[PDB]
Symmetry: D2
Subunit: 389 residues, 4 copies
Amino acid sequence: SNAETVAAIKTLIQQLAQSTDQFGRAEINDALRELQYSLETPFDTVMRMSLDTCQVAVARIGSDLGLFKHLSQCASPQSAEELADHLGCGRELMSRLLRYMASVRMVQQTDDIKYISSNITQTLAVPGLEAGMRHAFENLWPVLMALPDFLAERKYPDIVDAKDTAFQKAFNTDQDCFHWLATQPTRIANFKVLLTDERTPNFLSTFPLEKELGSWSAEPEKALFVDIGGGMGHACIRLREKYPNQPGRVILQDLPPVLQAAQATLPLSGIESMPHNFHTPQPVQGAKFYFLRLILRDFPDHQALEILQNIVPAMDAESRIVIDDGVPPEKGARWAETGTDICIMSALGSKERTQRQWEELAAKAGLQLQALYQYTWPVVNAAMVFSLQ
Amino acid sequence: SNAETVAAIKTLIQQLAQSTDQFGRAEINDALRELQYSLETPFDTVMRMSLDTCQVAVARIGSDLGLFKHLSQCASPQSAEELADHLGCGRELMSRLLRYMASVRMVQQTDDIKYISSNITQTLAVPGLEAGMRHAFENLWPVLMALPDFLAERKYPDIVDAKDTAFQKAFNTDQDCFHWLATQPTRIANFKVLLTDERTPNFLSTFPLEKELGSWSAEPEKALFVDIGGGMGHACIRLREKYPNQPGRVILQDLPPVLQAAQATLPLSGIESMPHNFHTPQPVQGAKFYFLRLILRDFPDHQALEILQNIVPAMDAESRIVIDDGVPPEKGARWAETGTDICIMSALGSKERTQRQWEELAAKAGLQLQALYQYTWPVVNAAMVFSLQ
Amino acid sequence: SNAETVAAIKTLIQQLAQSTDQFGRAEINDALRELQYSLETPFDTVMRMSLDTCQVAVARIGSDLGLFKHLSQCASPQSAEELADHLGCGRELMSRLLRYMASVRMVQQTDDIKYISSNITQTLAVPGLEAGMRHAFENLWPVLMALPDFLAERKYPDIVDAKDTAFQKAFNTDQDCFHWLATQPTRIANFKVLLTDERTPNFLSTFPLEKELGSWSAEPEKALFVDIGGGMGHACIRLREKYPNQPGRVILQDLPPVLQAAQATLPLSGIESMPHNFHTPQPVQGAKFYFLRLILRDFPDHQALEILQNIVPAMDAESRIVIDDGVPPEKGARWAETGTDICIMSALGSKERTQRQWEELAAKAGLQLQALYQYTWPVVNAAMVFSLQ
Amino acid sequence: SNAETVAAIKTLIQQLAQSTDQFGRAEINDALRELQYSLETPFDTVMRMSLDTCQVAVARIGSDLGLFKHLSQCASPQSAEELADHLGCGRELMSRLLRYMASVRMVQQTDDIKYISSNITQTLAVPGLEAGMRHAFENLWPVLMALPDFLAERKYPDIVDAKDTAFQKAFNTDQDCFHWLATQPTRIANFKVLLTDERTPNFLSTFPLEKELGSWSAEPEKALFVDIGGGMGHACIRLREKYPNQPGRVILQDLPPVLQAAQATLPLSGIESMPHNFHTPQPVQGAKFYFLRLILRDFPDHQALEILQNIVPAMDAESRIVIDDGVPPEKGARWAETGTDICIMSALGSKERTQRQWEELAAKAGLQLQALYQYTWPVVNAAMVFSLQ
Ligand SMILES: C[S@@+](CC[C@H](N)C(=O)[O-])C[C@H]1O[C@@H](n2cnc3c(N)ncnc32)[C@H](O)[C@@H]1O
Ligand SMILES: C[S@@+](CC[C@H](N)C(=O)[O-])C[C@H]1O[C@@H](n2cnc3c(N)ncnc32)[C@H](O)[C@@H]1O
Ligand SMILES: C[S@@+](CC[C@H](N)C(=O)[O-])C[C@H]1O[C@@H](n2cnc3c(N)ncnc32)[C@H](O)[C@@H]1O
Ligand SMILES: C[S@@+](CC[C@H](N)C(=O)[O-])C[C@H]1O[C@@H](n2cnc3c(N)ncnc32)[C@H](O)[C@@H]1O
Ligand SMILES: C/C=C/C=C/CCC[C@H](C)C(=O)c1c(O)c(-c2ccccc2)c[nH]c1=O
Ligand SMILES: C/C=C/C=C/CCC[C@H](C)C(=O)c1c(O)c(-c2ccccc2)c[nH]c1=O
Ligand SMILES: C/C=C/C=C/CCC[C@H](C)C(=O)c1c(O)c(-c2ccccc2)c[nH]c1=O
Ligand SMILES: C/C=C/C=C/CCC[C@H](C)C(=O)c1c(O)c(-c2ccccc2)c[nH]c1=O
Ligand SMILES: [Cl-]
Ligand SMILES: [Cl-]
Ligand SMILES: [Cl-]
Ligand SMILES: [Cl-]
Ligand SMILES: [Cl-]
Ligand SMILES: [Cl-]
Ligand SMILES: [Cl-]
Ligand SMILES: [Cl-]
Ligand SMILES: [Cl-]
Ligand SMILES: [Cl-]
Ligand SMILES: [Cl-]
Ligand SMILES: [Cl-]
Ligand SMILES: [Cl-]
Ligand SMILES: [Cl-]
Ligand SMILES: [Cl-]
Ligand SMILES: [Cl-]
Ligand code: NA
Ligand code: NA
Ligand code: NA
Ligand code: NA
């Protein structure tokens, strides 16, 4: 029986998944995708590409309605009628949306055709993750929609400039993306929520702090850690939590509105909040670690180089710049890192960088790679430690 | 070891897939998708929704470049540089596109970092399947991009009318989709190619023609099969191929430009090409089978009913209307049929119909269901045989 | 490809086995056996039954030669010639024995046609486990060889009596097995070694000792645990190890030659060694637990009842008799417990007992079951706690 | 859940087994055995070796009772009581035997504790396969039981002589096995039934007869095929069935009592029955094929050589001796061929032979190997074609 075979595959892959760690589960998931793509018929390939688009549109509708938050806190299954009436949605529309969501596990449909939350329901109810989905819909979709004709009309240029990529066509503007976004209050508000998401694991799981410090002295009033564009300060928080007795100032640098949003959740002491624009010279002199997490991927080389050149003059011989970012391999890169590469090309003019590309960029700033500490697999994020050449 | 476990999973799934038929492979593939969604982390869920969008955009670029057709006819692996120079693409852009494509199996990357075709490459090189992907990009994505704000602005109405859905917002028109498309030659050209795709399997794999025929006589000069909106006439061609000895007229009905396109590949004899607008009364009297394949799903009830009411007066007691279309279940419907439902709601105002919904529609035309012959699984397509009530 | 499928099956089963515990691995192993028997051809079934016999005979030869102990301490693969010369075996005989052993994993053969130890090699090198294999060869096989003609000659009687079973035919004696064995020094010597094997896990893994103890007082000088026929005293040793702070006498009871063998490995204090024949009245009065592990399975009902009736008069109201033995289910019993049943029927006239059969036996002694604490699965061993009725 | 995992393993291995051929299923079965042996605990290893012995003893009892034949023709499940009364067995004995048989799939136990035939029940009801099991019990078991002490008392000699192996100790005789068996009427009767079993597949599935014949002419009255020790003549029958129009005499040679038993099932014409002792000179001169299937494995080299030397003088340059027998590999031999090797060593003084060992034996008769045609895997049986040197 087909049904018996399918259920047996599910049982065995679930047991295997439970028996490994998060990195092993990520490897299994990538293999399931690869299997799916190799076993689909030609028609199925086009149907998948045609319809998987629906998920973000329907998640955006569920978010607008508050459906995922509401379902995540219901204690019993809800009918489509009950959901429609509670959330202010046409009843037939709600029923069709729910049937679609259940078919892609965005909710669960029960045997009596009522609806309960799934793992994905709970995910889309989390503010920061919801904001990620909303960002995909309102910022990524339009640049991807513009990219093919942008490239066709321009005879397939290498994209190298944040002011000359698909974003300008998609939003009918000559501004670059970051400048334009700063003029759009609802879009800024969504980024504020997005910053509350904290990725796990983080670089402290493999960063050999005591080894990298050696005999470094914090006196007088030297900074241990300067978190440049640190957002809510998650890296500073985790550093203080893991090494509470390590001397040295721990400093969160960001723009004033982000620092203001960070205050409610920062510790009352031990982490300084310092307004600082990272396109301007670094004020903190001689720090041990100048930390850039998921900053430089958003900039083409010219701008990324300028960000580094604003830090290098503040370094002493013991200082290090730590770039915590994606490091895709030379070959066999996975969809999460190549897809990111295409999206940030189209919106930002930037790119994912291999280790050798990071080293070439840093050498232009007078920096040499001393160590690289991977902390996620198989898609690699790593803390790259650079010193003055 | 975890690599070894992943390779063993692939080996076993590949072997189970080869030991079943196409319907069993479709069930396995849906299971792999369900497993993937249940094993992903919350972050991975949002990453997948954010990035799976990239595939249609990049497939559209490769189609514009002629990459898939070129790679499918190459006899040896090609470097990114070779492909970029041949196709007229910036070398860095080409390399980045190819790395993304290899990561989603749109091409395959070799250990030498060169590129060969995959199953998906070959699929996207086929004109009719390529046209389906291009249709998703240029027609479906704009209406899905418009749907959430359309619904929000209108306070979530049940969509019931082809003239009042997301299409009018997406394309800034008051026309319905079909009327607007007829004014857009480049889109018309893509639909012309899309009509050359023939779906497999088809209803003749399970339709018990001799049983449904009974003792119907083709004498003196009666019509066996009238293919209403038959496109290229594939159903007529397959009918004559499978039943070469059954007498009676076999008639392809469509609009003149489509009949003209059909002529080159119709048999030289045995199939008549009759121009006929199915919004007007059916001219062929007393045919055994009036066949509507994938026609009525494109219309809301009011218009679908009109199409049926145009046929009913031509029927005699032995005539049957055969609706060949999707028949999703009452519960547990799959993503291909619910995703289709959301898309045709958004572009056409129409809907997928369960068996009970098909029967209710047909009853309004004075028709009763006699038999239903499924021919695909697990997503249901079936030939529904209706007679006069 | 079929090689690849077989390797993938091994990889997946090995991984599932490592992800569970010993009871789950035992369930997997029984499943593999059931699969083997259902997939074999009729010829293969007869070949398996004909040849699996070879394993005990060849293990007995390797034990005689000292092969398993020698190979288990070798640091490099050994050739057949090296092993034959070292152990004093004909070179061709040795090579043929080793090829047979490697084919059933009793040793492993390398790609260079040399030999190293396997898990089974190490097992057969352990004195107590080796002695179990030697017991099967010299005591069990003769009684199984005699059983079919014993039954045929006697017209298939229910075997009820230790003095009238297959043992008397096998060994040409009118003595019962236990009485005969006491006259056979080489067999006695093997049993002495077999007693040093300690089974794992044991009842203390699940026995809720503090709950069963309640408020029992060891004062003034009462007995906590009387191990009746305790052999080397493993239960006493493990009890004192797990419950080092529970007061009360812990007493090992057995016959003098066995107590003398136990002395070298008993703790220096805390466990008394008391000679006692369990066919005579229990001398220790009012103990909390009188413990019988794998004793009563060796006796038919009449004699097993006598052993219990010898203990009952020593019991006070808080005393309990704890039978630790096999408890096969009413249906679906596994080969280890039914194979044991046939063997002890044939040698000893006794039987495995279900829970209901244990309760019926104990009721004849005036005892009632209070609790049953399973500690192995799927083959059931359990500590059954009985009190005065 | 363990039960869910185990059921899923069973489902997947059954589906994989169905999807391959008989040789692939044999490979899966050997892998399941290997998995079982590597995953068992040390105690489980000794319990398996101790108890798997029970299967042949209990099958012999079921055979004596007629249980397997009776159950194989019952149309409903039978209780132990019904079986006991019908077959003349003590009721408790029958119930215990059935529980044991069900635990090793020799019968099936139902949920209401009644009994139905399994695949193995049906196998043990087939006369020739039943006779194989009975042969294992009455002829193989005693020589295996005698082998360890035979080898110990003789200081581990290479066994090379049919008159000096374990058989003489086991049966207290100076005769060799074949001579002694010919004096034992019940044992002869069992061999008569055993000869009715026909192994599948056979050498004609891969033997390129037309290629090996070339331009061979059958005139005058030449023999195509002389089946030396051909038993019931299955090889002659299959040859005539597959090549009905091939000229040349087809001759079955065996001893008179076997030829007599063969007459009832031989074709009425086209196969000659010729009494002939293969320890005497071959009477048929110049035959194309002198065929020896499973003959020479039963003889030490000296006797096997004599059998060949009785044929070689009858050969002309076109004649071939075809040895159809086991050809174990140089390394990695499987249990069915090494177990056979140990059994025939112990009973017959003979041995399994690798290809190189067959060639060394045949060269002593003045023969050279021209071709070898395998027809079973992974345990190899092959038709080896030899010509005069
Ligand atoms: C991708 S978020 C990275 C946050 C943080 N590094 C982390 O991983 O937890 C980019 C951050 O850069 C900050 N940012 C953007 N432009 C900046 C600028 N010109 N100067 C300082 N911070 C800036 C944003 O406010 C935001 O917090
Ligand atoms: C989904 S397509 C092709 C379906 C076709 N029955 C098949 O399955 O092979 C719909 C068809 O309806 C035709 N069509 C659209 N409007 C029509 C009309 N008013 N009258 C007749 N045919 C029409 C199109 O030209 C097209 O060939
Ligand atoms: C299966 S063995 C060891 C069982 C032991 N209870 C254990 O599980 O560790 C049976 C024990 O009963 C002992 N035994 C046999 N007959 C006895 C008797 N009449 N009185 C006391 N002990 C006896 C043997 O000496 C042996 O130690
Ligand atoms: C293992 S059976 C093989 C039967 C046959 N070759 C087959 O594979 O179908 C051995 C055969 O050799 C025959 N045999 C034994 N001794 C013989 C002898 N001295 N001369 C001729 N046949 C003999 C037996 O009667 C029996 O038929
Ligand atoms: C909260 C969880 C979110 C899961 C997200 C997967 C994100 C994939 C996504 C392409 C991504 O990576 C990045 C961006 O979109 C952007 C950006 C920023 C502003 C405008 C457009 C794009 C910058 N830099 C990135 O890296
Ligand atoms: C060759 C394979 C092609 C796959 C194409 C996409 C299949 C999914 C896709 C939603 C689908 O089904 C349908 C349509 O898009 C449309 C339509 C027609 C015109 C405009 C917009 C939509 C009508 N009716 C449908 O049913
Ligand atoms: C009907 C199905 C039977 C399945 C059988 C597996 C048979 C294994 C079995 C050791 C085997 O092979 C052979 C013999 O016992 C003998 C023999 C013949 C006479 C006396 C003792 C042994 C000869 N020659 C063999 O080869
Ligand atoms: C170290 C592992 C050893 C495994 C040994 C074989 C386990 C199976 C085995 C049938 C078993 O269980 C029992 C006996 O043989 C006997 C016995 C004792 C004396 C003579 C004959 C049998 C008693 N009572 C049993 O229960
Ligand atoms: Cl929101
Ligand atoms: Cl809301
Ligand atoms: Cl660390
Ligand atoms: Cl095109
Ligand atoms: Cl829009
Ligand atoms: Cl299809
Ligand atoms: Cl026909
Ligand atoms: Cl549904
Ligand atoms: Cl020993
Ligand atoms: Cl006997
Ligand atoms: Cl155990
Ligand atoms: Cl304690
Ligand atoms: Cl049972
Ligand atoms: Cl018989
Ligand atoms: Cl009988
Ligand atoms: Cl052939
Ligand atoms: Na409802
Ligand atoms: Na409608
Ligand atoms: Na009894
Ligand atoms: Na019964």
